[PDB]
Design a protein around this ligand. Structure first.
Ligand SMILES: CCCCCCCCCCCCCCCCCC(=O)OC[C@H](COP(=O)(O)OCCN)OC(=O)CCCCCCCCCCCCCCCCC
Ligand SMILES: CCCCCCCCCCCCCCCCCC(=O)OC[C@H](COP(=O)(O)OCCN)OC(=O)CCCCCCCCCCCCCCCCC
Ligand code: HEM
Ligand code: HEM
Ligand code: HEM
Ligand code: HEM
Lengths: 49, 60, 379, 55, 445, 53, 102
């Protein structure tokens, strides 16, 4: 059955601000994108130097 | 309050051109800070041995 | 089963040289393209055998070249075929570009642009190779043309100090010119691979300019033996130019050692640069002269956007044929004027020659194209 | 409208070899050494080019 | 006549509230036939993964007999007047509607009196509907579009009550009992969650008198006095990919999180969908369609069909596209589709905004033709918005959209977001999630 | 705008894309003065002038 | 325009030289998207005649020969077979471009 499948538990892997299932997103997505792109921007700065 | 990475994403990291401008300006400020700090570490580990520490007896 | 179509290395050779469809009516001019590749290999091979004895040092460069000619077994043969093969390379290159202009081959814009990149690279390679033997003419030509390259305000003087590696032309310039002269033909070979790759997506052009897909033949055995015959004719011309007139195209002033205090009465480059030289001194301003040289060599890049006829080749355009042959005549006059000193009446002839050159390429040929379009009752 | 990655010929070649090349998902750190050999070859070309300017 | 006052000439829906909190709304027109329906806030989002198929099972049993009319006699009450009795269940709204004539308007309310109040659930009907629903889902999993949309809801709303299907898993279908359906009917078929909508040749006062006299005994009182809250759902950017190479061609849907009902920028998003639109292999325009995605999809023969959807729920939703195509073009379709989204975030010009506004205006007016779509809009609008939005208000909200706020809204919802991907079929050339995530932004912006 | 890019729509594309091109030009100018160590423009700022390039 | 322009047109038609390869005027047109679409819209008879004339011209220019003078295409008998198709393709392309302007 196509209704018999469901996504398994990802609570070992997902971040703390997206762990709560009963809280909607688009409140912390900017913070997560900012953190990951901050890592990307800082290593780009080091490589450019 | 909105977080510091949230303001960083909404104001600088959203577009790609502002991302590149932030990378360039951060590279300028970071090469200034890193070069001064690493140089200062270098004379703090090697005090009294470099030429700059001993160009007072003979420079006049 | 067969290795010609299934083996991944022989598939490339079969797709490019064996089962490649080619127009059945292309004249001998197309052979020039393959000749250019052969010249490249010849130059590279002969260049390698000059590099086993050349010493890049200002004390022992002229002496090393004389040792190549006088003491190395058949070293005079290798040196003079390298020199006259550079000359034959430029002859074949000029006729290749003339074939591209006449038969409308610049509509392959990517192939044309990789071509003009190749032309820039081979001009720089021949320049630094001519600096390499370190005679009087090498030193003084390098000093003159690099010092006029320095004419850009606030930027050109730092660039010429960086190119020279010092206050003027010295041993650092000679050694870095040796390194650049050795390494540039391999970028030239890779760019020729990209040139052929950009060509083979669409096929060759034909002298009529029409769609030759109605009648095409395989490259083997027809154009294989045609290019073999062209190679044999080219080797006749080259070996006549080495074994009988080894310094007819050369300059005798390169046979003295480089004395930095001995300014020659005349200073010239080699002949294949001379026309641009006559466009260089046709303007009495150094920025204007250098930029006009850049436009005189980059107007080939501007050429595909100056095409106005609804036809492609000049085979059915007599007025534009006349303008093309006037352009070739003007180029010959520019070469002769650049050979000549800067006196009367060569200055006014050179000025009118450069003005007519830029006017014919820029203005007169689209006007002739639209006139022939109106004349053929289609516009 | 087309895709310039898959229709332009040298872009098609680099797309075949470097971007859309189907590679195994489980290759270990021992598979990095071919690219290491290539970039060390390029380092050798560049450093030797600058060395031969004075040798 | 200008479009605005022609839209004002439409009669207004009349809404009134009983003492039970049940809403009664009607719209009057000149038709001889009427459509009367009951809309209940009882979907699969109100279930707690042990009654995951309770709504579907109940809507199967709801026409099988009441405690006053035993079984097939109810069928006679519908079939002796020519009325058409229908029901459906979404993830949030469940409707029992019926189309009849105006002269039969009192008696048919009697049916909606005892369908939602006095349903009788005989046990033989329970096992009969049990194996009927089992073979119904065994039929329904062949339809790859329903499978892809259920997969998209599963992977977009992981661990939430909004991921589960309306039908539910097969193990609950073999496990729902009589008392569980009784508990579901007691908790969810209450008085303030029910809207009685009528459209067509009806009068609001007669409908109110009938609605009072029949549905004045609907509960309004709680069983355990614990209010079932309708919590926010966490959208999760992810993928699900079911690779089955024996299938002839693949269905792929990509969505992002959208705002829902209450947010007015939804209307702006609709115009964005009207720029991209839809395409099928059996169209007529050919290469000359205005949609650049459709034009490039017929110029390169990329896809069998594509469509764009904006599905909404309580403070959430999905917003995206779904295409069926052969395998050998899948990623190219993705690339072209993503490019269109980026144009709507960056290079929105007034010509396509005017075209999308005209398309949305014509589609919105032409969708509200017919008593059944009008009654559907009344019931769904009073369940969602709590009021019926007149079409003049929709026209005023549409007219305020220009290109600047269009690309502002599209940069809000589309640009640099984490989508939910669902693929089914030969989806080997469907790109990995990092490629779609890289396609959600431009380096030229 | 050779022969057929003259219209209101390409004017709107230009009015949308000149800010992005201007930001990219700012990126290019800052990268130029960063890499080349330009004496005119880098001598205005207070921070970078500690090493005086 | 009356006296010698037609005479200069005849002399230029002789001088350009595609008539001695048997070609018509519209065979000599270099392909664009417009010309390729106009060729694609041609009927089978004119398409086959055009392609035979083109490959006959390529055969003649292979051997560096020309047709005999009686087989040269006459100036008056030269038909402009393609140019209504080409003008229609140019007109619909101009319509598409002016719609894309606004
Ligand atoms: C000298 C040879 C002149 C010559 O043979 O001209 C005739 C030929 C044109 O003949 P065609 O119209 O193709 O007709 C075929 C049957 N006659 O002419 C040709 O095929 C000439 C085509 C051009 C090849 C010669 C190029 C000469 C050098 C050009 C230098 C300038 C290039 C750009 C430099 C910047
Ligand atoms: C109307 C003409 C009639 C000609 C009749 C000839 C005899 C006909 C009967 C015998 C048959 C002979 C062979 C036939 C050959 C083909 C047909 C023919 O005669 O064509 C004439 C030929 C091309 O015709 P068309 O293009 O129409 O001429 C325009 C003139 N510019 O045009 C020409 O030959 C004219 C070419 C003139 C070129 C003058 C160039 C002057 C400028 C050169 C400058 C060079 C650079 C100088 C330096 C600049 C800087 C200082
Ligand atoms: C470095 C020297 C060059 C080499 C080795 C080279 C090599 C070749 C080769 C092998 C071909 C295919 C054979 C042929 O059609 O003749 C060719 C064709 C062509 N080359 Fe070059 N080329 C060189 C310089 C140039 C330059 C400078 C240009 C531009 C002016 C150019 C433009 C073309 C064009 C347009 C063709 C297409 C021929 C046609 O279809 O008409 N090449 N070249
Ligand atoms: C990788 C290949 C090449 C190598 C290693 C090479 C090496 C050399 C060397 C060592 C010399 C100095 C020896 C002498 O002057 O007799 C020289 C001279 C020269 N080379 Fe090359 N060369 C190469 C390719 C080319 C090419 C492709 C050209 C043509 C553009 C060229 C043009 C010249 C010229 C004009 C001279 C001066 C000849 C003279 O003394 O008058 N070389 N080359
Ligand atoms: C000149 C130095 C070499 C370079 C630059 C080079 C380059 C590469 C590259 C780029 C790859 C693909 C990436 C990888 O698998 O690591 C590769 C793979 C491979 N190379 Fe080399 N290689 C070199 C030397 C060799 C030698 C000496 C051998 C033979 C003993 C060899 C045999 C292979 C094989 C068998 C593979 C495929 C391994 C696999 O697919 O897992 N290579 N090489
Ligand atoms: C074409 C590119 C290359 C050039 C131009 C080049 C040039 C040179 C030059 C001029 C030297 C002498 C400088 C010195 O010895 O201090 C040198 C040394 C050397 N090269 Fe290369 N080289 C190249 C590539 C390579 C490669 C690929 C290798 C092998 C990995 C290599 C291995 C060496 C070694 C071992 C030395 C001796 C270093 C020493 O003892 O000082 N070279 N090369």
């Amino acid at each position: 059955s196509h209704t018999d499948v469901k996504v398994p538990d990802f609570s070992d892997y997902r971040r703390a601000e997206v762990l709560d299932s009963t809280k909607s997103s688009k409140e912390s997505s900017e913070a997560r994108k900012g953190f990951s792109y901050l890592v990307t921007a800082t290593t780009t700065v080091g490589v450019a130097y | 309050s909105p977080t510091i990475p949230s303001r960083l994403y909404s104001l600088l990291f959203r577009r790609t051109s502002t991302f590149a401008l932030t990378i360039a300006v951060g590279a300028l400020f970071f090469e200034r800070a890193f070069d001064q700090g690493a140089d200062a570490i270098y004379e703090h580990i090697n005090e009294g041995k470099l030429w700059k520490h001993i160009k007072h007896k003979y420079e006049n | 089963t067969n290795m010609r179509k299934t083996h991944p290395l022989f598939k490339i050779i079969n797709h490019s040289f064996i089962d490649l469809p080619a127009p059945s009516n292309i004249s001998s001019w197309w052979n020039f393209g393959s000749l250019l590749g052969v010249c490249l290999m010849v130059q590279i091979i002969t260049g390698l055998f000059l590099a086993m004895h050349y010493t890049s040092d200002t004390m022992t460069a002229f002496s090393s070249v004389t040792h190549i000619c006088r003491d190395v077994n058949y070293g005079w043969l290798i040196r003079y075929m390298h020199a006259n093969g550079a000359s034959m390379f430029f002859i074949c290159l000029f006729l290749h570009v003339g074939r591209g202009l006449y038969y409308g081959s610049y509509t392959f814009m990517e192939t044309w642009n990789i071509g003009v990149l190749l032309l820039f690279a081979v001009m720089a390679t021949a320049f630094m190779g001519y600096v390499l033997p370190w005679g009087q003419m090498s030193f003084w030509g390098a000093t003159v043309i690099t010092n006029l390259l320095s004419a850009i305000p606030y930027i050109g003087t730092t660039l010429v100090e960086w190119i020279w590696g010092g206050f003027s032309v010295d041993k650092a310039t000679l050694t870095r010119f040796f390194a650049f002269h050795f390494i540039l033909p391999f970028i030239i070979a890779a760019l020729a691979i990209v040139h052929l790759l950009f060509l083979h997506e669409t096929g060759s052009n034909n002298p009529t300019g029409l769609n030759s897909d109605a009648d095409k033949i395989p490259f083997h055995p027809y154009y294989t033996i045609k290019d073999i015959l062209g190679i044999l004719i080219m080797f006749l011309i080259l070996m006549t130019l080495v074994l009988f007139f080894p310094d007819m195209l050369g300059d005798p002033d390169n046979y003295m050692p480089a004395n930095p205090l001995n300014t020659p009465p005349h200073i010239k480059p080699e002949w294949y640069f001379l026309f641009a030289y006559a466009i260089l001194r046709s303007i009495p301003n150094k920025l204007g002269g250098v930029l006009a040289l850049i436009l005189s060599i980059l107007i080939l890049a501007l050429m595909p956007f100056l095409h106005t006829s609804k036809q492609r080749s000049l085979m059915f355009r007599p007025i534009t044929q006349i303008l093309y042959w006037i352009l070739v005549a003007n180029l010959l006059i520019l070469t002769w004027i650049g050979g000549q000193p800067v006196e009367h009446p060569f200055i006014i002839i050179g000025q009118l020659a450069s003005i007519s050159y830029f006017s014919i390429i820029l203005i007169l040929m689209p006007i002739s194209g639209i006139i022939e379009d109106k004349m053929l009752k289609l516009y | 409208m087309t895709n310039m990655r898959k229709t332009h010929p040298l872009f098609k070649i680099i797309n075949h070899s470097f971007i859309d090349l189907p590679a195994p998902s489980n290759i270990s750190s021992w598979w990095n050494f071919g690219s290491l050999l290539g970039v060390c070859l390029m380092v050798q070309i560049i450093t030797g080019l600058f060395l031969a300017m004075h040798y | 006549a200008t479009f605005a006052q022609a839209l004002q000439s439409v009669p207004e829906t009349q809404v009134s509230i009983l003492d039970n909190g049940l809403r009664v709304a009607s719209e009057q027109s000149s038709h001889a036939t009427c459509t009367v329906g009951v809309w209940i806030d009882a979907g699969s989002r109100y279930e707690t993964e042990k009654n995951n198929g309770a709504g579907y099972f109940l809507e199967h049993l709801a026409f099988k007999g009441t405690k006053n009319r035993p079984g097939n006699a109810l069928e006679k009450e519908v079939e002796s007047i020519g009325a058409h009795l229908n029901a459906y269940s979404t993830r949030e709204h469940t409707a029992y509607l019926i189309k009849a004539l105006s002269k039969d308007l009192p008696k048919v309310v009697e049916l909606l009196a005892d369908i939602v109040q006095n349903s009788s659930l005989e046990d033989s009907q329970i096992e009969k509907e049990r194996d009927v629903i089992l073979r119904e889902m065994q039929e329904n999993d062949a339809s790859m579009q329903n499978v892809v949309f259920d997969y998209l809801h599963a992977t977009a709303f992981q661990g939430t009550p909004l991921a589960q299907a309306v039908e539910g898993p097969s193990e609950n279908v073999r496990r729902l009992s009589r008392t569980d359906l009784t508990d579901y009917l007691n908790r969810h078929y209450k008085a303030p969650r029910m809207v009685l909508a009528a459209a067509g040749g009806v009068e609001h006062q007669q409908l109110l008198d009938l609605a009072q006299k029949h549905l004045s005994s609907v509960s309004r009182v709680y069983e355990e006095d614990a209010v079932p809250g309708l919590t926010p759902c966490r959208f999760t950017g992810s993928e699900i990919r079911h690779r089955d190479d024996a299938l002839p061609l693949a269905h792929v849907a990509i969505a992002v999180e959208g705002p829902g009902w209450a947010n007015p920028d939804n209307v702006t998003l609709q115009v964005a969908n009207a720029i991209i639109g839809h395409y099928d292999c059996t169209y007529g325009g050919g290469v000359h369609l205005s949609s650049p995605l459709a034009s490039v999809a017929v110029a390169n023969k990329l896809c069998q069909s594509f469509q764009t959807f904006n599905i909404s729920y309580s403070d959430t939703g999905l917003l995206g596209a779904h295409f069926v195509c052969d395998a050998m073009s899948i990623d190219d379709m993705v690339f072209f589709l993503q490019g269109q989204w980026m144009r709507l975030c960056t290079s929105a010009t007034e010509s396509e905004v005017t075209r999308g506004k005209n398309i949305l205006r014509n589609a919105l007016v032409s969708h509200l033709d017919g008593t059944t779509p009008v009654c559907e809009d009344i019931g769904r609008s009073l369940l969602t918005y709590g009021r019926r939005i007149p079409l003049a208000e929709w026209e005023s909200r549409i007219q305020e959209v220009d290109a600047q706020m269009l690309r502002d809204i599209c940069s809000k919802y589309f640009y640099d977001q984490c989508p939910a991907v669902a693929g089914y079929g030969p989806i080997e050339q469907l790109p990995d999630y990092n490629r779609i995530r890289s396609g959600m932004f431009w380096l030229r912006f | 705008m050779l022969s057929r890019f003259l219209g209101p729509r390409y004017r709107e594309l230009a009015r949308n894309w000149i800010p992005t091109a201007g930001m990219w030009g700012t990126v290019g100018a800052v990268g130029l003065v960063w890499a080349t160590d330009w004496r005119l423009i880098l001598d205005w700022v207070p921070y970078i002038n500690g090493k005086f390039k | 325009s009356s006296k010698w322009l037609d005479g200069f047109r005849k002399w230029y038609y002789n001088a350009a030289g595609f008539n001695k390869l048997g070609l018509m005027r519209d065979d000599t047109l270099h392909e664009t998207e417009d010309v390729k679409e106009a060729i694609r819209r041609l009927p089978e008879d004119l398409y086959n005649d055009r392609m035979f004339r083109i490959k006959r011209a390529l055969d003649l220019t292979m051997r560096h020969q020309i047709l005999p003078k009686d087989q040269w295409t006459k100036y008056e008998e030269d038909k402009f077979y393609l140019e209504p198709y080409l003008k229609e393709v140019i007109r619909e392309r101009k319509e598409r471009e002016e719609w894309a302007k606004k």
